[PDB]
Design a binder for these strands. Structure first.
Length: 62
DNA sequence: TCATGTCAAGGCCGATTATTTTTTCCCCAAAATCGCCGGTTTAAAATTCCCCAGAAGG
């Protein structure tokens, strides 16, 4: 639930940001939002974040 | 058909490979210990030879 993709739960239903909704309709992909304060529903990407931040960005210097 | 947690690393165990140390086996030579047989010595037991008494036979 990022404000760059939504604008709050209008009584349970989600209100999509108009510009982002236009962007999604342009590329055709349907957006979805998991839920407030529940990151389990997107465990794949969070675990990938753990993977990258404990494998790549641990000692690499730039 | 919605929404819905997933992946990697670390630790432990087992098996395999490599290195080192210890123990055993086989063959030969020398020394020591043990076993068997024979001979010698000691102790105990058996047999035969002379005079006194008793019993039996002619």
């Amino acid at each position: 639930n990022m404000k760059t993709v939504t604008d709050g739960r209008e009584q349970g239903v989600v209100k999509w940001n108009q510009r982002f909704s236009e962007f999604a309709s342009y590329y055709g992909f349907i957006p979805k939002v998991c839920r407030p304060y529940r990151a389990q529903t997107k465990g794949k990407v969070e675990r990938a974040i753990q993977y990258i931040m404990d494998h790549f960005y641990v000692g690499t210097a730039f």
